[PDB]
Design a protein around this ligand. Structure first.
Ligand SMILES: Cc1nc2ccccc2[nH]1
Ligand SMILES: O=C(O)CNC(=O)C(=O)O
Ligand code: NI
Ligand SMILES: [Zn+2]
Length: 327
């Protein structure tokens, strides 16, 4: 078996290998990349997402989210407080202010320590889930706005035609902005491109050990657990690497730089934080290998988590008993 220790793998495709997205994903999995739950892809030196990021300041962040934490340093929840709209220009200025900017630090490892020690005492503001793309329309390879759709994948694999569309989202981050422990909707894949700015550190649990994370979460957030059989779908829970280690949860860490792709694999729990002002673009996708995961994916029973229009059809076809129960 390839990659038995479930390490995060890093790939360096040539411009020739970069031409067939599906085939390259299949290649990565033939080498066992999926066992980690997450892989890094460094694009060919000749490739570019777009010419420059010069005129992006007029993008609107209609609902910036202030991330307010509760709990203790290593085990906390965050809730999202809606703020008034601001442009990317204004946001960047805010990220750079004395109040919100990245602190002085000796190296990544010093910065990671500062994050987990001090995160809960601040409330950084995130521009999340903004529908759109920064890929140039003439960028033909690994253009996240030009991927084949999950609906077409399901149709090719299962022969059923369904409604729904699948488009990318932009994320504008600043120091300490946080994404909580989660897997994707319907345990789909995700692909994430860091277009510009400061790095993004990722933590990830191997899919074959996901239930171990869930069991720890049940113990650490006992109230949330009683309220919903799948509360990690609310995307509000954070658990530090120190606490994971203390409880024997297997996991790995890796830091993504501007110009790099990350791919998360079905049922690979992940979480992380931003080092400073940046902008990422991400979208979900599927392969034939995803189908069985989609069938087994756990759903939020309490109503807290949002179910997009397109997810409805996924649940209807892959999980008709749960769908009927929903009704
Ligand atoms: C691979 C890697 N790890 C990092 C940590 C901090 C800044 C840049 C980095 N790049
Ligand atoms: O970048 C973020 O804030 C969160 N991204 C993801 O969870 C993802 O791409 O799967
Ligand atoms: Ni994700
Ligand atoms: Zn719920």
């Amino acid at each position: 078996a390839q990659n038995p220790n479930c390490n995060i793998m890093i790939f360096h495709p040539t411009k020739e290998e970069f031409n067939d997205f599906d085939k390259y994903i299949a290649y990565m999995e033939s080498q066992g990349a999926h066992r980690a739950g997450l892989a890094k892809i460094i694009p060919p030196k000749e490739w570019k997402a777009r010419e420059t990021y010069d005129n992006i300041s007029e993008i609107l962040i209609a609902t910036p989210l202030q991330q307010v934490a509760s709990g203790r340093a290593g085990v906390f929840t965050q809730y999202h407080k809606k703020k008034k709209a601001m442009t990317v220009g204004e946001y960047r200025h805010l990220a750079n202010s004395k109040k919100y900017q990245t602190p002085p630090h000796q190296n990544f490892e010093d910065l990671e320590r500062k994050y987990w020690k001090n995160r809960i005492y601040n409330s950084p503001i995130y521009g999340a889930d903004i529908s759109g793309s920064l890929f140039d329309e003439n960028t033909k390879q690994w253009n996240l706005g030009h991927l084949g759709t999950i609906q077409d994948l399901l149709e090719k694999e299962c022969g059923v035609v369904i409604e729904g569309v699948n488009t990318p989202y932009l994320y504008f981050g600043m120091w300490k902005t946080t994404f909580a422990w989660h897997t994707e909707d319907m345990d789909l894949y995700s692909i994430n491109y860091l277009h510009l700015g400061e790095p993004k550190t990722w933590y990830v649990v191997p899919p074959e050990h996901g239930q171990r994370l869930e069991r720890l979460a049940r113990e650490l957030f006992p109230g949330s657990s009683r309220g919903c059989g799948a509360f990690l779908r609310h995307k509000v829970a954070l658990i530090s690497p120190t606490v994971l280690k203390e409880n024997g949860i297997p996991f790995n860490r890796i830091t993504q730089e501007a110009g790099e792709f990350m791919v998360t694999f079905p049922y690979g729990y992940h979480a992380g934080f931003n080092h400073g002002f940046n902008c990422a673009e991400a979208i979900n996708f599927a392969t034939p290998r995803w189908i069985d995961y989609g069938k087994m994916a756990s759903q939020c029973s309490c109503g807290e988590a949002r179910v997009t229009f397109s997810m409805d059809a996924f649940v209807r076809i892959l999980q008709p008993e749960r769908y009927d129960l929903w009704k």
